[PDB]
Amino acid sequence: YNTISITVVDADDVGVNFVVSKVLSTLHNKGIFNGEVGVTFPRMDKNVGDIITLFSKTGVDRKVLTSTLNTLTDFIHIGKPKEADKVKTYRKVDTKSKGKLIRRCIKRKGVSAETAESLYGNYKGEKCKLPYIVVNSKSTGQRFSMFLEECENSEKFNSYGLCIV
Template sequence: MDNYVDLIIRADPDITTPTLLGNLYGRVHLALVSQGCGEVGVSFPNHENHVGLGNVLRLHGSQSRLSTMLDAIQLGGLRVHLDIQGPLPIPAQVNQYRVVKRVQAKSNPERLRRRLVKRQGISPEEARNRIPDTAKRTLDLPYVNLVSASTGQHFPLFVKHEDCRSLPQQGAFNTYGFSSRATIPWF
């Protein structure tokens, strides 16, 4: 992972940055699915400076893989809202790395109860006793709104940038460009 690409969203008075980011990230996700490689990581370097995830989506990987990814992302009319920088080499002075991962809240107690009934064969009443309505959990993390390609439903994809660490950790990335173990260089 020696290169990166910054996809920078330009300010637009008619379309909010989070809307453009959701559209862009949805297209990046589809390209990651079609490439199926696990070699490209995603981060949002301005997430700490902005409400939400900021205006920069950064791709991490090898120069050849990133070039292939840029060709695979169907930007269409979204291109006029972007500045694309890279692939560029990772700065030599990088000494911090971090895990970027998806976090899902256990936010629907009814769904959790149905799963418990199905998997453990207990009664719905017992499931309600084990998982009360107060078990609902919400997240205080930045997110990007996506649309499911299979169902057409809108959903928030919550993103957590873990604390920085001094050593990189190798591993594969999923089709969202995230990993629970692999790090990306942080700069």
């Protein structure tokens, strides 16, 4: 599948990962990831890396995405579209912490608050140490951290560039 590169440059004044996350947000908000364009990162060791890599099967051109990232052009670099027979596809993994599932136990099982604390008191509290990005969510008005990890390649992708199922 042919692919394109979006490398964050000159982001020292601002962290590199903040520019990476803003690149993800601007690629989300102006379309791009309809259902078939996916992201991958060549340098996840402990950081998310500074290269966004889009491996759309139909083909991503330079002009559409450089018009999309007109806001990041001061510290971005776009390579010409190259080809890759295999891309290392990542997916979204989310975390739950206490009250999250407590409200689920309010609205699914219909139990009271104290017994919902009782079934979950000694449980939960997982801690994801995977490399991540920090995403502005616009439909739900709060900003969060989204965790990415390696999984088998899927035909369909989300609106963010990660695998489905």
